[PDB]
Amino acid sequence: LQEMKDIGVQADANAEMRARERRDRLHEALSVNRSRVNQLEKQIAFCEA
């Protein structure tokens, strides 16, 4: 229990599930946005060529 107080994270079960869900959807959103950025950049490069 002292180690638990040391780590200092509430880590509630409901909080755990919610947090993992939100951060994972953030991860996928980031990846998709980066892919969109790459696609648009390639389109612009094609336009220049």
Compute φ and ψ for 22, nearest 5 degrees.
-65, -45
Q: What is the resolution of this structure in A?
A: 4.6
The CA distance from 46 to 30, in Å, is: 24
Distance CA 33, CA 15 (A): 26
Q: Long-range contacts made by residues 19-24, C-beta under 8 angstroms, separation at least 24?
A: none
Q: Which residues of 38-48 are buried (b: 16+ CB within 10 A; e: fewer)?
A: eeeeeeeeeee
Write out the two tokens for 26. 């953030």
To which residue do tokens 């993992």 refer? Answer: 20
How far, in Å, CA of 46 to CA of 39, rounded?
Answer: 11
Q: How was this structure determined?
A: cryo-EM
Rounded Cα gap, residues 35 and 31, in angstroms: 6
